[PDB]
Design a protein around this nucleic acid. Structure first.
Ligand code: ZN
Length: 125
RNA sequence: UUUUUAUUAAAAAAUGGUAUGUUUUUUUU
């Protein structure tokens, strides 16, 4: 093949326009947050949704996500099957997004929305 | 005083006839 079959590592920066996964990044960031991020905003966390079996959702998603890259933050909603793993790098984040879609933990993986938390926005900034 | 010749056209759409307007959520602390 003409593309790397290995996993992104820490220093694998790419140009801002190009998606780190080889695709191209638009500007509108879509409406359903589906395919590829926007070069106008820099986010590393992605919505993953789907099964809500039991209380061990945190550990199952941690096991099923840490093997895709380096993790900075994980927040899982207990009431509903929603998790918001935050990755350290764009490369690992987008690789995980394209690797955890329609998989078994089907997962409804999307891009995260702007935080409404006045406290979370401050620490993110 | 014998014979004539002269030949337009012409089908389709909208008016016009099963109006129209509405309509599904990822974080707060
Ligand atoms: Zn390949």
């Amino acid at each position: 093949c003409e593309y790397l079959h290995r996993l992104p590592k820490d220093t694998d920066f790419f140009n801002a326009n190009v998606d780190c996964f080889g695709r191209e990044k638009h500007a509108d960031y879509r409406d359903d947050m589906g395919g590829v991020g926007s070069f106008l905003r820099q986010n590393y966390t992605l919505y993953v949704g789907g099964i809500t079996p039991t209380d061990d959702i945190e550990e199952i998603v941690s096991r099923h996500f840490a093997e895709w890259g380096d993790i900075e933050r994980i927040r899982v909603l207990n009431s509903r099957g929603i998790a918001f793993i935050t990755y350290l790098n764009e490369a690992n984040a987008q690789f995980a997004k394209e690797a955890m879609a329609h998989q078994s933990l089907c997962l409804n993986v999307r891009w995260a929305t702007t935080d409404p938390n006045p406290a979370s926005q401050a620490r993110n900034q």
